[PDB]
Amino acid sequence: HLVCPMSKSPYVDPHKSGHEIWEEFSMSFTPAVKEVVEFAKRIPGFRDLSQHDQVNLLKAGTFEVLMVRFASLFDAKERTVTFLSGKKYSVDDLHSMGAGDLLNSMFEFSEKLNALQLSDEEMSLFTAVVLVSADRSGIENVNSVEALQETLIRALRTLIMKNHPNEASIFTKLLLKLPDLRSLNNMHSEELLAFK
Ligand code: HEM
């Protein structure tokens, strides 16, 4: 089994080589990855970062961007995960196929985010913040990335205050999702790299 919803299905043909399995999986997740690249190019200040820092932000942050974008695949009420094919699998079945604490943590994350029911504009600006907030270990011009982060966070505060003048705490709640995403990213990378 391959219990990642970026796949078309969690079932693996055991008579395929590791390479064929990855190739097929890549045909499923690659369009999503390319969509994050096009999204990043549309953050105006992103293009002013060095080419190295652009690539490194995408390398570190693509997972967190997609986690936000695809939080709606996790239906906490139905306890189902929708895979990129549109097929749905119960949490129980996925656990029997080898999913565990990480899947549970993503449900918890998605439930809390899904429940905020952000508008498209709010979700899009939050996602920009997520990308530019990516792990900085690979970054050559930290101050430039921090400046862009600050600019986007200010825009997000302004948008949230417009849209939620009596619930400003939504802005703080969104910032507090950043270390949660970093945790999901760390745990997920461990699972990704352990895949045999
Ligand atoms: C291109 C991006 C991604 C790749 C290449 C990838 C790959 C993988 C691989 C190889 C595994 C281990 C599968 C197994 O052992 O059965 C995994 C686990 C998983 N991934 Fe992904 N993934 C990606 C993005 C995402 C995203 C964006 C999400 C959430 C929206 C996600 C959700 C999950 C879940 C729920 C698991 C199982 C967690 C558990 O074991 O409890 N993946 N991923």
Residue numbers in the entry: 381 to 576
From the article:
The closely related REV-ERBα and REV-ERBβ proteins generally act as transcriptional repressors, either on their own, by recruiting co-repressor proteins, or by competing with the Retinoid-related Orphan Receptors (RORs) α, β, or γ for the same DNA binding sites. Using transcription assays from native and model promoters in cells, we report that the REV-ERBs are also gas-binding components of the molecular clock and that gas and redox state modulate the structure and function of the REV-ERB LBDs.
The formation of well-ordered crystals required the addition of trypsin to the crystallization solution. Two identical structures were obtained using constructs comprising either the complete LBD (residues 212–579) or the LBD with an internal deletion (residues 241–579 Δ 275–357). Both 1.9 Å resolution structures include α-helices 3–11, (residues 381–576; REV-ERBβ381–576), which is slightly larger than the fragment used to derive the unliganded LBD structure. The two REV-ERBβ381–576 Fe(III) heme structures verify that the heme-binding pocket is in fact present at the same position as ligand-binding pockets observed in other NR family members. As predicted by the mutagenesis and spectroscopic analyses for the oxidized state of REV-ERB, a single heme molecule is hexa-coordinated within the pocket by Cys384 and His568 side chains. The structural changes that facilitate heme binding are confined primarily to helices 3, 7, and 11. In the presence of heme, helix 3 straightens, swinging the end of its N-terminal half (Cα atom Gly398) 16.4 Å away from its position in the unliganded structure. To facilitate heme binding, it also undergoes a major conformational change, swinging its C terminus (Cα atom Leu576) 15 Å away from the ligand-binding pocket, forming a gently curving, uninterrupted α-helix that covers the ligand pocket. First, the imidazole side chain of His568 makes a ∼120° rotation around the axis of the helix to allow bonding with the Fe(III) heme center.
